[PDB]
Structure 1
Amino acid sequence: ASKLPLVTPHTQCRLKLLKLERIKDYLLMEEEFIRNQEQMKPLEEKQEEERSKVDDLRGTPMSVGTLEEIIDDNHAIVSTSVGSEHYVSILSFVDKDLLEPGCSVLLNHKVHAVIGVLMDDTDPLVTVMKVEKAPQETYADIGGLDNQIQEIKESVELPLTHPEYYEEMGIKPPKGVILYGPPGTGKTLLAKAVANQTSATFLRVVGSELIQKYLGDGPKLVRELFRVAEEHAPSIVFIDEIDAIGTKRYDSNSGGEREIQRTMLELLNQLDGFDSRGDVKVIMATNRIETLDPALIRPGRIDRKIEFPLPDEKTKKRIFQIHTSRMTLADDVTLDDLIMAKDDLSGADIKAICTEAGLMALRERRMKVTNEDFKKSKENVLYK
């Protein structure tokens, strides 16, 4: 039960013999120590006697109150659910430690004295923003990039899995990572691969839903966001499409662009607060890297800037090989004709043509996908 942290001898050596046999000595002494209590203590039982005595102190109508201050000599001002508030005292089975301003407590029904504290069932927004399971397959699903993969493992994964290199180097990891390029080139996809890979708690928020309809609710949402991200452990915060805070204007926003601006001010703090930040990693992505404020883009707030180019054809054929792997491909087709059909197709375009061609197969109930499926498929996808 969290008895001792020194576990380092690791082998059949004798620090373990003397030390594990030392707590073993004090557990023979502990067992025969407590053995005299059940041997020669018939006065009270104390396993439930004094427990039932506490349960006879506290009444059955256990009211739930709220903390707003603390005075140390076991009395404080607590608020009832009505709003009228008291100056009750605090019991001695209330282990004054989980008492913060705003905490849910248990009061008496009669004199409303502080009986116990209450575990919080938590805000649903944490479960809203928390990614639970692994999204999809690994980095082998990606293909073609092979350089920025080393960059992202370099900035995120290798600091996590090997915290030896940076200490023999005498260095800290690079802080901020941003992603940019043309749309549909794998920016979200690589983040799915990282969410597959890591063991840190992973958070994802769309940049569009940063904006609000009430005044200051944006920056309050940012503050409680980084509260949530900090209060866990070594985590990863992902933000997609942060240009959308600057591009579009919506009529739900009661403030103008001079509320969006203040939201960017509070975020601009929360990347680079004077406070000790902690073990929080930030991964950002957009396709309009030129629109936003470069004060958010400076090194110190974002260190590594990673461009995603359009696929060259050699890489394209690899992507065809990926998205046509487990499908019953008829031999009629030639992928090299399908490569140069569009000069600047994205990685999403290939998967769109493959899936839509499979839909053309399931129109005719067949099992293999033929050439004219691709011939009308590129007409369906590309041209409209």
Structure 2
Amino acid sequence: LDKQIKEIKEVIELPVKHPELFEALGIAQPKGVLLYGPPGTGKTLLARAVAHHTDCTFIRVSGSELVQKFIGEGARMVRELFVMAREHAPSIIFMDEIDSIGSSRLEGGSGGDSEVQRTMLELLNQLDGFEATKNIKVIMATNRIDILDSALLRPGRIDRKIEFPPPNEEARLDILKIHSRKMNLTRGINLRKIAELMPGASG
């Protein structure tokens, strides 16, 4: 996942350490990244890793009611979490979309229409020029971008999109070598054949 690492570094790490480098070209610093791909291909760990290396307080919201008591007493709105974000200025907000959301009916198509989507719509509408403090970023992880509503696909809203294709032979072999280190192995495994015996899988 080296190319994805480079692409996310250009829009996360750079506009914190060297803002003047972006001011030299006189363009606004990006604030929106969207990651898309099949489930289990390594999106959430990547967001966690980049937030770890840049030293940013990694915050994520799932809209549950257990944690609500920490955000506020009633929290009629949803923007109230900014009251807690700006105290840890270099912060990142993460949001995840459920694996099953259709367009016909049932999940996604019927019942509800967005949930996570309306949350990012509100958040981006906030920090589009009305926000004073800087160094706040937003990320999602969804599959099948074609189902996103049109209000979120406007050319000026999302700054970057990144795709996570299912691994090929080399990626499967590397993941296997990474994850077999935790076990007591034996001299000579020839796990190349093991990788070649698994096809069209996930990481």
> The TM-score by the shorter chain falls in which range?
0.7 to 0.9
The structure number with the bigger radius of gyration is 1
| Equivalent residue, structure 1, for 2:130 | 276
Is 2:7 the counterpart of 1:151? Answer: yes
Unaligned stretches of 5+ residues in structure 2: 66-73
Cα 1:181–1:224, aligned 2, differ >3 Å: closer, same or farther? same
- Structure 1 counterpart of 2:68: none
Give the distance between the partners of 1:223 and 1:270, measured in 2 at CA: 7
Give, in whole Å, the separation in 2 of the partners of 1:333 and 1:305. Answer: 39
Counterpart of 2:93 (choices 222, 226, 237) is: 237
Change (3 A) 1:324 1:263: closer
Write out aligned runs for 1:167-246 (5 A): 167-206=23-62, 209=64, 220=76, 222-230=78-86, 232-241=88-97
Partner-residue secondary structure (3-state), 1:164: helix
CA shift in 2, pair 1:324/1:295, >3 Å: same
What is the CA distance between 1:344 and its match in structure 2? 1.3
Report what 1:102 is aligned to. Answer: none
Write out aligned runs for 1:315-330 (5 A).
315-330=171-186
Write the deviation string for residues 88-145 of structure 1: whole angstroms up to 9, x where unpaired.
Answer: xxxxxxxxxxxxxxxxxxxxxxxxxxxxxxxxxxxxxxxxxxxxxxxxxxxxxxxxx1
- Aligned partners of 2:96 and 2:140 also within 8 Å: yes
Give the CA deviation at 1:157. Answer: 0.9
CA drift of 1:316 comes to 1.8
- SS of the residue aligned with 1:324? helix
Q: Distance in 2 between matches of 1:173 and 1:295?
A: 21
Q: Which has the higher contact order (CA 8 A, sep 6+)?
A: 2
Matching of residues 106-185 of structure 1 within 5 Å: 145-185=1-41
Deviation at 1:326, TM superposition (A): 4.3
3-state DSSP of counterpart to 2:181: coil
Mind listing any 5+ residue stretches in structure 1 that lack a counterpart? 1-144, 211-217, 250-255, 348-384
Q: CA–CA distance in 2 between the matches of 1:159 and 1:297? A: 23
Taking every aligned residue pair, what percent have the same amino acid on both sides?
53
Given that 2:33 and 2:139 are in contact with CA atoms closer than 8 Å, whether structure 1 keeps it comes out as yes
Cα 1:265–1:192 shift into 2, 3 Å: closer
TM-score, normalised to structure 1, is 0.43
Distance 1:331 1:184 in 2: 30
For 1:269, the aligned partner's letter is E
1:317 and 1:266 map into 2 onto residues whose CA distance is 38
**Alpha carbons of structure 1 residues 220 and 230: separation in structure 2 relative to 1, 3 Å:** farther
**Equivalent position to 1:306, from 162, 171, 175:** 162
Q: Stretches of 4+ moved more than 4 A in 1? A: 242-247, 260-267
Q: Deviations over 1:246-300 (max 9, x none)?
A: 7737xxxxxx53xx56985564233123652242101111123222313123343
TM-score, with normalisation over the residues of structure 2?
0.77
* Residue of structure 2 in register with 1:74 after alignment: none
Q: Secondary structure at the match of 2:138?
A: strand
The residue number in structure 2 matching 1:248 is 107
**Distance 1:275-1:171 versus aligned 2 partners, 3 A rule:** closer
User: Aligned residue pairs: how many?
Assistant: 188
- Root-mean-square deviation (CA), in Å? 3.1
